[PDB]
Copies of this chain bind each other. A is one copy, B any other.
Amino acid sequence: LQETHDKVFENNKSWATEQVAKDPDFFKKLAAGQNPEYLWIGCSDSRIPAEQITGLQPGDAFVHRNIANLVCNTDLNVMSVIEYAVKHLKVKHIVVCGHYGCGGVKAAMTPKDLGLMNPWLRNIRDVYRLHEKELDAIADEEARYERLVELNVYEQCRNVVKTAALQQSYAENGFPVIHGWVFNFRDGLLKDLNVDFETILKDIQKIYNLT
């Protein structure tokens, strides 16, 4: 199956050519960099790029994607990207976008030994336990699973709010604001979970109120 990859280069040239066909300054626009307005934290197993889903222009989104769109406090990968987006790129928005049908969430919920994946998926099991009463009450399994996807987005938003960068910038500037959204591969629609950003911040501030 040696040919399959050499094909990726032909499809790349084709895409470049039509994009110039669609717009002559396409790669001229691309080159002069205005900072992204968004930090997007999404899932590695979601199937459509944020830029497609949202209609955002190239360079408008700075993108982190990981299994189940997690924001873990001892994960330097994501922590350093939040820090960098807020403090140095001066992003106006941070979105955590989950998606229904998420493979990572489903795999988190399977009681098996997944090696290296175990401590990663553990975070999702932690989300479940944080809402155990509500989740267990939901009879249908798929409905429960979708609710878990949603609560995970909410909890990862809470974890973004805990960051010093976010709080300092918000105090000083009133930005970035945080959004929790969920994409639905069935109808292609983005849904806003209407994450109550101000109240999350107030709850976290009870023991961590900075200037």
Contacts and interface: CB of A to CB of B under 8 A. Distances in A.
Interface string A173-211: 000000100000111111010000000000000111110
Given A14-B55, A66-B64, A83-B116, A78 B76 contact: no
Contact of A113 (B59, B65, B164): B164
A97 to B, nearest CB: 11
Interface in A146-173: 162-164, 168
A167 to B, nearest CB: 9
Interface in A43-100: 44-45, 47-56, 58-59, 62-67, 72-81, 83-84, 87-88, 92-93
B179 A76 contact: no
A56 B48 CA distance: 11
B113 A116 contact: no
Interface residues of A, number: 91
Contact of A81 (B36, B66, B78, B132): B66
A77 B190 contact: no
Interface in A83-124: 83-84, 87-88, 92-93, 101, 107, 109, 111-120, 122-123
Residue from A75, A77, A122 whose CB has the most chain B CB atoms within 10 Å = A77
Nearest to A85: B44
Q: Give the oligomeric copy count.
A: 4
A62 B83 contact: no
Interface string A1-26: 10001001101111110011000001
B119 A79 contact: yes
A117 B8 contact: no
A143 interface: no
Given A27-B187, A73-B123, A76-B116, 15 more contacts: A1-B92, A8-B190, A9-B192, A14-B55, A16-B187, A47-B58, A49-B49, A72-B74, A73-B74, A77-B120, A80-B117, A109-B207, A112-B210, A116-B119, A118-B163
